[PDB]
Amino acid sequence: DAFVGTWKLVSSENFDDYMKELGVGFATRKMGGMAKPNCIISVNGDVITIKTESTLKNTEISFILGQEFDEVTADDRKVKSTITLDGGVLVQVQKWDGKSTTIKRKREDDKLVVECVMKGVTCTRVYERA
Ligand SMILES: Cc1csc(-c2c(NC(=O)C3=C(C(=O)O)CCCC3)sc3c2CCC(F)(F)C3)n1
Secondary structure (H helix, E strand, O other): OOOOEEEEEEEEEOHHHHHHHHOOOHHHHHHHHHOOOEEEEEEEOOEEEEEEEEOOEEEEEEEEOOOOEEEEOOOOOEEEEEEEEEOOEEEEEEEEOOEEEEEEEEEEOOEEEEEEEEOOEEEEEEEEEO
């Protein structure tokens, strides 16, 4: 839809702090902090696929809106994830060990804007079309 396409990371703010708040260790934060992923989003019927491709690590999720699924995150958390569409925004929550983080993806002008919240830390990652 509005989200479908191949997107390339152009900016990131507070990603190291966001990863620290998740409990991510130094080596993995060093890898993630300097990654400039592509995000490839596609839809086939009820199923949406989001691939994140980067030099040192790829991940992929496929999901139906409002249906919880198991996810292994890039930092190796085993989480229960639910993604919904709310006022044009894809809202993802990941739940594990009584904690949660939210990842919201929204389209603004030319950009795909990704807001990641963990406790008091808010990170903003912006992608543009490849
Ligand atoms: C939590 C955590 C630890 S590490 C890591 C992570 C990447 N996270 C992303 O891109 C993320 C988003 C996005 O912008 O799509 C939005 C959601 C949040 C997370 S990308 C990438 C790594 C490490 C390995 C790598 F090879 F460096 C490449 N996420």
